[PDB]
Design an enzyme around this catalytic site. Structure first.
Site, PDB file in Angstrom:
ATOM      1  N   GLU A   1      12.021 -44.147  26.585  1.00  0.00           N
ATOM      2  CA  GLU A   1      10.855 -43.958  27.428  1.00  0.00           C
ATOM      3  C   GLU A   1       9.797 -45.018  27.188  1.00  0.00           C
ATOM      4  O   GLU A   1       9.172 -45.497  28.138  1.00  0.00           O
ATOM      5  CB  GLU A   1      10.292 -42.569  27.234  1.00  0.00           C
ATOM      6  CG  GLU A   1      11.201 -41.431  27.736  1.00  0.00           C
ATOM      7  CD  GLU A   1      11.539 -41.518  29.197  1.00  0.00           C
ATOM      8  OE1 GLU A   1      10.761 -42.043  29.942  1.00  0.00           O
ATOM      9  OE2 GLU A   1      12.579 -41.052  29.579  1.00  0.00           O
TER      10      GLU A   1
ATOM     11  N   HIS B   1      21.885 -34.603  42.376  1.00  0.00           N
ATOM     12  CA  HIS B   1      21.518 -35.793  43.113  1.00  0.00           C
ATOM     13  C   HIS B   1      21.894 -35.728  44.575  1.00  0.00           C
ATOM     14  O   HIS B   1      21.304 -36.407  45.422  1.00  0.00           O
ATOM     15  CB  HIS B   1      22.188 -37.003  42.501  1.00  0.00           C
ATOM     16  CG  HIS B   1      21.627 -37.362  41.211  1.00  0.00           C
ATOM     17  ND1 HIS B   1      21.920 -36.673  40.060  1.00  0.00           N
ATOM     18  CD2 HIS B   1      20.807 -38.371  40.855  1.00  0.00           C
ATOM     19  CE1 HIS B   1      21.287 -37.236  39.047  1.00  0.00           C
ATOM     20  NE2 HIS B   1      20.615 -38.272  39.501  1.00  0.00           N
TER      21      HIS B   1
END
Ligand SMILES: *[C@@H]1O[C@H](CO)[C@@H](O)[C@H](O)[C@H]1NC(C)=O
Ligand SMILES: *[C@@H]1O[C@H](CO)[C@@H](O)[C@H](O)[C@H]1NC(C)=O
Ligand SMILES: *[C@@H]1O[C@H](CO)[C@@H](O)[C@H](O)[C@H]1NC(C)=O
Ligand SMILES: *[C@@H]1O[C@H](CO)[C@@H](O)[C@H](O)[C@H]1NC(C)=O
Ligand SMILES: *[C@@H]1O[C@H](CO)[C@@H](O)[C@H](O)[C@H]1NC(C)=O
Ligand SMILES: *[C@@H]1O[C@H](CO)[C@@H](O)[C@H](O)[C@H]1NC(C)=O
Ligand SMILES: *[C@@H]1O[C@H](CO)[C@@H](O)[C@H](O)[C@H]1NC(C)=O
EC number: 3.4.17.23
Lengths: 595, 201
Positions: free
Chosen positions: A355, A485
């Protein structure tokens, strides 16, 4: 006419840089405190930002791109002149929005029951995924798997039957052949000599590259099959496809949960240093500070004061509803934050590096004009986050920073266990991504008739991946719809391209760092040549063709599998030596339900 | 030689409010004893850019007027306030001459000027039809024409209102935080005794 267009974009920044920030903060606040007040505020700010984009876009469209010689202005105009939403009539627009919200809802609320045991009614992502992850009960796993297809997949299917029409009409209104073609525009380069890339090029590069990947996959597949046959002795054929419900997840996307069955040398310990962090009294703050040190050691900037004062590093200390799936934020106006709930463990350690890698990329291109403040393409944000994690995880690093004992000795068997776990995570997923996108592209394109969607879905999974359904499902089902998705309208190929970029970057940077060993032992920490080399690309944002931007770091204008193969070649060598008493590859005729 | 008619620098660096950069203030300082040391030895300033006079000479120099120009800008624009610079502030909100004789002093005011929700009270000029001369101030609010038409003074296609607000917020990152800038311009016309450093024996 850039006298007018550049003037317009200077006015655009004068509004946009603020409205995006208000929207952006409202989203942040919602995620850190989930309450109706924040929901209404993020929705209102969201709509203001969207309305502003629609008005602004309408004005951008006065300035024809063909008049523009300055590429920076041309790219900025291309970014907000996009039509997209509202190219279709209001009823069509509302109907599509209704369908998409419906698809998302069926997935997220899709509570599936066991007819023989009502206490088993659950959603996928809490608890039902535990059965698909960790149970070794063939029939229990099947009940979970089949139940999701019959209870969620079939229900989403009719939304897909209408959706592909609405999305293709939108795409045609935007001058794309279909919606698959619309999505592939993300990789297009058009108008830069020597760097051009047509949309259809992605298909050729993906298929070509995949063929080169296959041998690694086939050997991994054979190895895994050899091990799963001991776990499931009456269910798996030595020369066939693996049953889908036995692959460790609801769709078989990753083979990471098969690790416990396939561990090469089970007598050896892992390089899991959760205990070191705990025994050494680490906390979340220590984890993020170690990650900061990693980046600054190679020439990257430190984190901002804002980041350290207002990021969410841990969970709330009270009964507070908040969402903290790890994610990096660029909130606008140089406000960078991280959102996650860090526990003291090796998985969060690596997540923090991932991150923060995204944040470093975001900081680097912060100097770009507002509309160019993004990654080179959809797969680059993660390619960068993944290489930061990949390097942080190597034993050399872990020993050097105090996570592995000074007396730790890496050996022959440890290396193999390490590489296999990563291969199951990566190699085992490349064919999934490849197959799914190939199918969706064929669907949007009209190559696969709606009455043949599952016929081809399963034929392709057996031919490409080597996975076979436990149940010969008909066309009332829609297996891919049951995946997040697909139900939530995301492109998927980004994972394929990201993986390939990840290894191209790791190899180029490892060489920049003058490493003298195997690629999987690379650690570019405390090495500034590699850091600067990457930085010089990160800072570009969308200002350059992704093909150019990539060449600047790895020496190529395209994807290249060799770095992946080089990363795993030592595992491959072992896998080739293994399987001297087994078959490599698979047939597509045999099925677990055959008789 | 004792001194008591000291210069009012203690007000202008320390003011309740600063002007918008597009309409910067001009404080004339004359007939007074200066002591610049309370500025140069202050830890409150981040920036001291001297182009003519310097921190080690000013304590002993005489001038006929010193002018303290003052305003609020976004932090990334601090670098534009200098001789030889260009950019939206240097070109048309506040221009310093290439032969500027003074010093530019600036500091972060995030905790004074930024507000939660956005402090939009500070304006900068986004557009002019030409660049400014040194120490010129332009406070016109007419609509800026980019197209073939003045559009009768309204915002519209190639018609823009030239003054835009800075969205200052306490959470903005550095460079998007407000800064207070005071520029001391120095001149010597006719009678230098009109402004001087300290007096002794
Ligand atoms: C909950 O939302 C409110 C908004 O009124 C906010 O003030 C509060 O700080 C939030 N709670 C937490 C723990 O952030
Ligand atoms: C695009 O803008 C840059 C800004 O420096 C300028 O140098 C470049 O020449 C412009 N492109 C063209 C073709 O003029
Ligand atoms: C897309 O372009 C067409 C071209 O005429 C235009 O009419 C349409 O309004 C644009 N749509 C959007 C949503 O920007
Ligand atoms: C970031 O700031 C810290 C403050 O202590 C400093 O120690 C560190 O060296 C700085 N890193 C960089 C890259 O400037
Ligand atoms: C372990 O090291 C020995 C050294 O003789 C080598 O022969 C053996 O193949 C290694 N083990 C593995 C799994 O490669
Ligand atoms: C960090 O850089 C120093 C420089 O001497 C080096 O000695 C140290 O081993 C490096 N640490 C890591 C984890 O690479
Ligand atoms: C401004 O006010 C502060 C209040 O603490 C004082 O210390 C300082 O000397 C004053 N003068 C200047 C020019 O800053």
């Amino acid at each position: 006419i850039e006298e007018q267009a550049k003037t317009f974009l200077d006015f655009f920044d004068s509004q946009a840089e603020d409205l995006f920030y208000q929207s952006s903060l409202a989203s942040w606040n919602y995620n850190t405190n989930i309450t109706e007040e924040n929901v209404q505020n993020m929705n209102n700010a969201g709509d203001k930002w969207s309305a502003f984009l629609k008005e602004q876009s309408t004005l951008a469209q006065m300035y024809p791109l063909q008049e523009i010689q300055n590429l920076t202005v041309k790219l900025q105009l291309q970014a907000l002149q996009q039509n997209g939403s509202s190219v279709l009539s209001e009823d069509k627009s509302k109907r599509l929005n209704t369908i998409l919200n419906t698809m998302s809802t069926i997935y997220s609320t899709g509570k599936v029951c066991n007819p023989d045991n009502p206490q088993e009614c659950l959603l996928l992502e809490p608890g039902l995924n535990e059965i698909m992850a960790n149970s070794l009960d063939y029939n229990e796993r099947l009940w979970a798997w089949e139940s999701w297809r019959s209870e969620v997949g079939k229900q989403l299917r009719p939304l897909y039957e209408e959706y592909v029409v609405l999305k293709n009409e939108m795409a045609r209104a935007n001058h794309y052949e279909d919606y698959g073609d619309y999505w592939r525009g993300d990789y297009e380069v058009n108008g830069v000599d020597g760097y051009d890339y047509s949309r259809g090029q992605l298909i050729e590069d993906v298929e070509h590259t995949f063929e080169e990947i296959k041998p690694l996959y086939e050997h991994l597949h054979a190895y895994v099959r050899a091990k799963l046959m001991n776990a499931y002795p009456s269910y798996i054929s030595p020369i066939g496809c693996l049953p889908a419900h036995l692959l460790g997840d609801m769709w078989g996307r990753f083979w990471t949960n098969l690790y416990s069955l396939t561990v090469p040398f089970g007598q050896k310990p892992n390089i899991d240093v959760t205990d070191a962090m705990v025994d050494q009294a680490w906390d979340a703050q220590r984890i993020f500070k170690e990650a900061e040190k990693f980046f600054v050691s190679v020439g990257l900037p430190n984190m901002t004061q804002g980041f350290w004062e207002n990021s969410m590093l841990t969970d709330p200390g009270n009964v507070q509803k908040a969402v903290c799936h790890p994610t990096a934020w660029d909130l606008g106006k140089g406000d960078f934050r991280i959102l996650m709930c860090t526990k003291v463990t090796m998985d969060d350690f690596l997540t923090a590096h991932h991150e923060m890698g995204h944040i470093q990329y975001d900081m680097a291109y912060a100097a770009q004009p507002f509309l160019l403040r993004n990654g080179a393409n959809e797969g680059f944000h993660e390619a960068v986050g993944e290489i930061m994690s990949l390097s942080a995880a190597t034993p050399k690093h872990l020993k050097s920073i105090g996570l592995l004992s000074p007396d730790f000795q890496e050996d022959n068997e440890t290396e193999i266990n390490f590489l296999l776990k990563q291969a199951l995570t990566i190699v085992g997923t490349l064919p999934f991504t490849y197959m799914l996108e190939k199918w969706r592209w064929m669907v949007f394109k009209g190559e696969i008739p709606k009455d043949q969607w599952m016929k081809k879905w399963w034929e392709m999974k057996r031919e490409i991946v080597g996975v076979v359904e436990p149940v010969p499902h008909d066309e009332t089902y829609c297996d891919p719809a049951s995946l997040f998705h697909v139900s939530n309208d995301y492109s998927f190929i980004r994972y394929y391209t990201r993986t390939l970029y990840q290894f191209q970057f790791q190899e180029a940077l490892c060489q920049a760092a003058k490493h003298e060993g195997p690629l999987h032992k690379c650690d570019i920490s405390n090495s500034t040549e590699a850091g600067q080399k990457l930085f010089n690309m990160l800072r570009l944002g969308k200002s350059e063709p992704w093909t150019l931007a990539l060449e600047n770091v790895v020496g190529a204008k395209n994807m290249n599998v060799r770095p992946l193969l080089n990363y795993f070649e030592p595992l491959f060598t072992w896998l080739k030596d293994q399987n001297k008493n087994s078959f490599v590859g698979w047939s597509t005729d045999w099925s677990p339900y055959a008789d | 030689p004792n001194i008591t008619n000291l210069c009012p620098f203690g007000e202008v660096f320390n003011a309740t409010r600063f002007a918008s950069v597009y309409a910067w203030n001009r404080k004339r300082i004359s007939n007074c004893v200066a002591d610049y040391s309370v500025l140069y030895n202050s830890a409150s300033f981040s920036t001291f850019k001297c182009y003519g006079v310097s921190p080690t000479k000013l304590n002993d120099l005489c001038f006929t007027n010193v002018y303290a120009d003052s305003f609020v800008i976004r932090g990334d624009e601090v670098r534009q306030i200098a001789p030889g610079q260009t950019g939206k502030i240097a070109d048309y909100n506040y221009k310093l001459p290439d032969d500027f004789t003074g010093c530019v002093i600036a500091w972060n005011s995030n905790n004074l000027d930024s507000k939660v929700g956005g402090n939009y009270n500070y304006l900068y000029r986004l557009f002019r039809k030409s660049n400014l001369k040194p120490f010129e101030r332009d406070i016109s609010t007419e609509i800026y024409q980019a197209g073939s038409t003045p559009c009768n003074g309204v915002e519209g296609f190639n018609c823009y209102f030239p003054l835009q607000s800075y969205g200052f917020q306490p959470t903005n990152g550095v460079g998007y935080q407000p800064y207070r800038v005071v520029v001391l311009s120095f001149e010597l016309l006719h009678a230098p005794a009109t402004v001087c450093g300290p007096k002794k024996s």
